[PDB]
Ligand SMILES: O=c1ccn(-c2cccc(OC(F)(F)F)c2)nc1-c1ccnn1-c1cc(F)ccc1F
């Protein structure tokens with residue numbers, strides 16, 4: 593109980609900021625996560641020994657792919673940590689408990705391939721889960737780990753609170769399916785503008801949590817420009833590998849995934865910022881005003897990509 597985890601001064605301060613980068617030292621990530629759970633949730637929410645053992649199994653079950661890896665998981669957990677910490681009073685106890693876990697577990701056992709490729713390859717997971725294929729698998733892996741011996745970090749919850757946290761985690765993980773993002777944000781926008789948005793409507797909270805999960809998931813676009821620009825290299829390494837596997841299946845990939853159309857990346861990013869990221873952090877800032885720094889960082893990077901196209905970098 594009286595073991596408060598502590599980061600060096602620079603991290604201790606910078607970890608509070610939305611644009612924090614967890615750094616290249618892999619063996620510090622688990623401790624960064626535990627620091628966040630304790631500050632966000634309490635040193636009581638989890639038995640340290642089970643938490644440590646859960647984290648390390650979750651790590652083992654992420655793969656050495658270029659983007660969808662252990663570092664992405666911990667990055668997406670930190671963004672949620674910054675949103676929870678900047679909206680102290682808006683979230684219940686279970687929610688704070690489930691969401692950080694859900695963020696750490698949301699891409700479990702990702703092989704670096706889109707749902708589309710799994711469907712076209714005719715992967716067994718595509719027969720097991722017809723929609724949100726990888727996202728149903730990720731949740732499945734989370735439950736499986738929770739059910740290992742000494743791995744049940746939710747042991748002290750009652751049967752009610754236990755089903756409530758697993759359902760929070762399931763909706764949060766399912767919501768990271770970008771195909772579901774667009775519909776969800778539109779309804780949130782319409783609700784917020786007609787003033788029907790009501791954070792006591794459980795159905796409405798579900799949507800707000802989904803949008804937060806998209807915002808956390810996409811948070812490489814909210815970093816300082818060098819991080820955002822270097823993360824893009826890892827993102828496109830996976831897109832181009834999937835483009836290669838599409839061509840092996842005798843299908844021309846969309847240009848995003850075609851490494852022969854590398855030239856088009858900077859314009860492809862503009863579209864994604866205009867169609868996806870900016871609308872995402874705008875609707876989020878409207879519903880949760882203290883998240884405005886993610887909108888501002890995202891606009892700044894949109895501006896940086898506009899400077900790439902114009903030959904100014
Ligand atoms: O930079 C990017 C360019 C394109 N897409 C993308 C992914 C999926 C469908 C898509 O098309 C559509 F616009 F219609 F959705 C575009 N995503 C990113 C991106 C930025 C940050 N995270 N990710 C990301 C999210 C992901 F979910 C997966 C991989 C990523 F790199």
Ligand SMILES: [Mg+2]
Pocket residue numbers: 698699726768769
């Ligand atoms: Mg995913």
Ligand SMILES: [Zn+2]
Pocket residue numbers: 664668698699768809
């Ligand atoms: Zn992800």
